[PDB]
C-alpha cells in the first residue's frame, strides 16, 4: 500500500528533505539508500514510502518540484541528498515570485504536465497505491499556487485516491512578503475542496515554540523545520511501522473527518526540551494536550474537539497511558463534543524517535482552528479593501472576482466551524 510523496517550492522542499532524513534514519536507511538497521520492524512496511532497487537499495517514492533550481540544488547537495531518484527532480528556471497566480496559472501551468509524468511513473509501479501526501507552504507561489494546481490535476487523474497535505500557514511574525495572506486565502479554498486531510502548521506557533520553549533567541527556518519533521514522523508512525492498528490513509480520514470540509488538523508534539532527563507518562500526556505544544496558533480551549488521535512512541506502561488519557479528558471535559462517542484514539508504537526514549504526537480536529482562518481572512481584507498589491495578480490574468470568491469561501469555512462548536 504505497504512498507517493510530493514536495513543492522552497518551504515544501526544505521540510520534505528533513522529513526524509528523519524517517530514513528511523528505518535504518543510510545516505546512499543502503539498509543498515538491526530490527525487522524497520523493513516490514518500508515499501509504504520506499521503492526497492537492486543492490539492496531503497529509494524514496518522492517527487521534488520547484519553479526555480536553487532549493533543489541545495537538497541534492544536502545530507541524504543522493538518496532521491535523480529523475524525480522536476524544476523550472523562471521562479514564481511569491505569486499564487504564477504558480497556479502561468509559470506553474507550463511545468505541471512533466510533474504528472513523474507521478504517473511512480503510481504505475505501485502494487496498490493508497494516495498522495504533499508538503508545501501556502504563503509563497510555487508550493501554494502550483501545489494546489497539482492537487487538482492528481484528483482528476486519480479521483478515488486519498490526498493529504502538510501545509505551512504564513504569519506576519515570520513573513517573507506582504502578499502571503492573498496566496494563503487562494490556496485554502483549493484545500477545502481537494484534500482529505490537511495538517495545519502555523509558522507563528513554530516560532513561538522555538523562542519561548526551546530558548532559541533567534530561530531560523531550520529550527522551525526540525519541529515539523519531528511532527511528520510522528503522524506517519502508524503507516510506517507494523502497528496492531492496521491503519491506512483512508481509515485515518474516515475516523478523523466527520464532515468533508472540516479536515484541517492541529498537530502537536512532546517532548519539546531546551536533555537526558527521563519523561514520565503523566508529563508526556499533559504536554501533548497543552496549547503551547501545538503547531497551529489556536487555543483549543476556544473551541471543541471533534476527533483526536494521540500517538505514543517508546517503551512505557500502557496502563499508565490510559490513566493519564482519562485524567486529561476529565480536565478538558467541556472541550470534547459529546455527540461523537469515544472520539479520542490512543495509539502506541514500540520504536522511539532518535534521541528520545519516548514521545507523543497529537492530532486534533478542533473547531478552534477557525481562529487560524479568521487571522488570514483579516489580513486578506485589510489589503483587499484597498485592492493593494493586486496588480501582481491581475498582471497574470486573474480578475478581482476570483479574490472575492476565495474570501467568501474561507469565511464560509469559518462559519461551519462555529456552527459545530455550538452544537
Amino acid at each position: 500500500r504505497e504512498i507517493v510523496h510530493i514536495q513543492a517550492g522552497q518551504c515544501g522542499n526544505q521540510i520534505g528533505a528533513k522529513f526524509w532524513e528523519v524517517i530514513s534514519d528511523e528505518h535504518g536507511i543510510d545516505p546512499t539508500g543502503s539498509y543498515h538497521g538491526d530490527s525487522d520492524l524497520q523493513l516490514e512496511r518500508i515499501n509504504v514510502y520506499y521503492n526497492e532497487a537492486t543492490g539492496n537499495k531503497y529509494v524514496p517514492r518522492a517527487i521534488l518540484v520547484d519553479l526555480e533550481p536553487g532549493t533543489m540544488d541545495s537538497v541534492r547537495s544536502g545530507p541524504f541528498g543522493q538518496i532521491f531518484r535523480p529523475d524525480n527532480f522536476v524544476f523550472g528556471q523562471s521562479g514564481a515570485g511569491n505569486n499564487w497566480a504564477k504558480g497556479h496559472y502561468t509559470e506553474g501551468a507550463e511545468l505541471v504536465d512533466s510533474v504528472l509524468d513523474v507521478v504517473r511513473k511512480e503510481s504505475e509501479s505501485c502494487d496498490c497505491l493508497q494516495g498522495f501526501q504533499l508538503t508545501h507552504s501556502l504563503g509563497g507561489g510555487t508550493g501554494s499556487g502550483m501545489g494546489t494546481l497539482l492537487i487538482s490535476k492528481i484528483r482528476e487523474e486519480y479521483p478515488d485516491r486519498i490526498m493529504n497535505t502538510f501545509s505551512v500557514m504564513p504569519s506576519p511574525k515570520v513573513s517573507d512578503t506582504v502578499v502571503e495572506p492573498y496566496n494563503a486565502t487562494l490556496s485554502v479554498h483549493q484545500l477545502v475542496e481537494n484534500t482529505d486531510e490537511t495538517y495545519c502548521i502555523d509558522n507563528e506557533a513554530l516560532y513561538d515554540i522555538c523562542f519561548r520553549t526551546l530558548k532559541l533567541t533567534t530561530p531560523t527556518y531550520g529550527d522551525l523545520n526540525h519541529l515539523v519533521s519531528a511532527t511528520m514522523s510522528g503522524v506517519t508512525t502508524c503507516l510506517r511501522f507494523p502497528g496492531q492498528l492496521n491503519a491506512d490513509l483512508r481509515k485515518l480520514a474516515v475516523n478523523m473527518v466527520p464532515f468533508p470540509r472540516l479536515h484541517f488538523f492541529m498537530p502537536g508534539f512532546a517532548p519539546l526540551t531546551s536533555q537526558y532527563r527521563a519523561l514520565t507518562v503523566p508529563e508526556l500526556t499533559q504536554q501533548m494536550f497543552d496549547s503551547k505544544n501545538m503547531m497551529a496558533a489556536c487555543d483549543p480551549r476556544h473551541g471543541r474537539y471533534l476527533t483526536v488521535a494521540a500517538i505514543f512512541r517508546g517503551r512505557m506502561s500502557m496502563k499508565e497511558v490510559d490513566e493519564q488519557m482519562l485524567n486529561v479528558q476529565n480536565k478538558n471535559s467541556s472541550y470534547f463534543v459529546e455527540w461523537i462517542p469515544n472520539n479520542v484514539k490512543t495509539a502506541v508504537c514500540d520504536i522511539p524517535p532518535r534521541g528520545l526514549k519516548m514521545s507523543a504526537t497529537f492530532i486534533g480536529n478542533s473547531t478552534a482552528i477557525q481562529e487560524l482562518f479568521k487571522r488570514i481572512s483579516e489580513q486578506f481584507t485589510a489589503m483587499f479593501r484597498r485592492k493593494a498589491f493586486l496588480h501582481w495578480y491581475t498582471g497574470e490574468g486573474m480578475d478581482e472576482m476570483e479574490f472575492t470568491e476565495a474570501e467568501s469561501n474561507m469565511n464560509d469555512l469559518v462559519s461551519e466551524y462555529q456552527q459545530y462548536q455550538d452544537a
Binding site: S152, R155, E156, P159, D160
Partner: protein
C-alpha cells in the same frame, strides 16, 4: 424437578431438567441494489470530473 431424555455414550451424556411447565431478496434483487449503488458512485464521479473540467 424431573429428568427426561437421558442419553449416554462413551463420550458423555445429555438430558433435560424441568423445574416447572409453562403457563428473502432474490438474486436479481441483490444484483439490482448493488448496481444502483454503483451507478450512484458513477454519477458522483461524473459530477466531480465535470467540476474539474470547468
Amino acid at each position: 424437578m424431573e429428568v427426561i431424555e437421558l442419553n449416554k455414550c462413551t463420550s458423555g451424556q445429555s438430558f433435560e431438567v424441568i423445574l416447572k411447565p409453562p403457563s428473502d431478496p432474490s438474486l436479481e434483487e441483490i444484483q439490482k441494489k448493488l448496481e444502483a449503488a454503483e451507478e450512484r458512485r458513477k454519477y458522483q464521479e461524473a459530477e466531480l470530473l465535470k467540476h474539474l473540467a470547468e
